[PDB]
A paper describes a structure:
Tripartite α-PFTs are members of the ClyA α-PFT family. We present the structures of the soluble A component (SmhA), as well as the soluble and pore conformations of the B component (SmhB).
To further investigate the differences in lytic activity between SmhABC and AhlABC the crystal structure of soluble SmhA was determined to 2.78 Å in space group P212121. This crystal form contained four closely related molecules in the asymmetric unit (rmsD Cα between molecules of 0.4–0.6 Å), with no oligomeric structures observed. However, in SmhA, NheA and Hbl-B, this region has an additional extended loop and short helix that extends the length of the tail domain, a feature not observed in SmhB or AhlB. AhlB and SmhB use both a short β-strand and a short helix connected by a loop, while SmhA uses only a short loop perpendicular to β1.
Residue numbers in the entry: 3 to 209, 226 to 367
Write the structure that this text describes.
């Protein structure tokens, strides 16, 4: 009986919001990697200088790819959801009970949307397979650069290892702060996201070439109106300490200080890329659930041949339409955010 058909978006609304959350942030981490000053100096360890410049270059290539290609691929999948909402409205409009065969024509269209949902499932799979491929190339790229930093650190005296750990610990703290700020800006999908950037630290380089390597860091847009004031205060305090800690490690190991600064930025990008891939892994299945739900619903909608059965079906469809319209708005805002969040503006005090 009709009482059992589910023409709803299921967990698509929430599933798209959990994707937006990481993809939008990863958009900002891509902008950070592309804004960061390159290492120019050729007056330091020739062997390690080439490993940093090579890694920094390989990261900007992947940041550009994510920013220009992968974001567009996602906006494509979101549009497909709007499109589906629009089609459900049409089914609603068809139930103006003017038509003497209204239930056979209704069944036919629900059966057709089952097909569309199956295409949107396959479209999502295609995007996930590309994200999975990049993940499998990014993990070993970062993994290899970590083994390079580690080999260098394993040969330092105790004073330098402590200066290096202080830095590693602060980068880990700063990442938790940024995440807290981004969550507050995002407002669980209903927010209009913006993150900024500024120079936060510097690495003096032994004695003009590149007097100093300038370190770019994410910043909140409003140092007193973001709805995560404690995180903004911790971020300010942590950047202050980060500046001091690089000045310390730099006295003796300047080039390692640089390598660490780059790896901290890579970590944010690769970690949230992995989370983007993982949230996207569930999307094809969720479209497939809409496909199965719509396939099962159609023959049941066809059995409705009475006055009260057609009235009940109009009601079941009108309700599920409202659900898709609400979802369509969540999508409109996500697309506006992917457009607006394409730039990571400078912030000044």
């Amino acid at each position: 009986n009709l009482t059992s058909i589910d023409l709803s978006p299921q967990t698509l609304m929430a599933m798209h919001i959990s994707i937006s959350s990481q993809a939008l942030l990863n958009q900002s981490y891509s902008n950070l990697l592309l804004s960061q000053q390159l290492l120019t100096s050729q007056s330091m360890d020739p062997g390690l200088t080439v490993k940093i410049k090579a890694y920094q270059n390989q990261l900007r290539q992947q940041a550009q790819v994510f920013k220009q290609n992968t974001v567009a691929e996602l906006i494509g999948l979101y549009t497909k959801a709007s499109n589906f909402a629009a089609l459900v409205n049409a089914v609603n409009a068809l139930y103006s009970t003017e038509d003497p065969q209204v239930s056979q024509k209704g069944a036919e269209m629900v059966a057709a949307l089952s097909d569309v949902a199956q295409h949107y499932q396959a479209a999502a799979q295609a995007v996930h397979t590309q994200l999975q491929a990049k993940r499998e190339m990014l993990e070993p790229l970062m993994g290899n650069f970590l083994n390079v930093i580690d080999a260098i650190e394993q040969g330092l005296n105790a004073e330098a290892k402590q200066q290096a750990q202080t830095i590693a610990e602060l980068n880990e703290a700063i990442a938790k702060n940024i995440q807290s700020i981004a969550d507050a800006g995002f407002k669980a999908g209903e927010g209009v996201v913006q993150l900024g950037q500024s120079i936060v630290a510097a690495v003096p380089l032994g004695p003009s070439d590149q007097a100093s390597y300038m370190i770019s860091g994410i910043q909140a847009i409003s140092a007193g109106a973001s709805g995560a004031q404690q995180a903004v205060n911790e971020l300010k305090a942590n950047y202050a300490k980060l500046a001091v800690a690089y000045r310390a490690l730099a006295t003796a190991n300047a080039l390692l200080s640089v390598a660490k600064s780059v790896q901290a930025q890579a970590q944010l990008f690769v970690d949230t890329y992995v989370l983007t891939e993982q949230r996207m892994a569930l999307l094809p299945t969720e479209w497939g659930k809409v496909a199965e739900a719509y396939l099962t619903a159609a023959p049941i909608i066809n059995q409705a041949g009475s006055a009260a059965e057609i009235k009940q079906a109009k009601q079941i469809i009108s309700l599920n339409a409202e659900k898709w319209q609400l979802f369509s708005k969540s999508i409109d805002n996500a697309k506006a955010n992917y457009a607006g969040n394409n730039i990571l503006p400078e912030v000044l005090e």
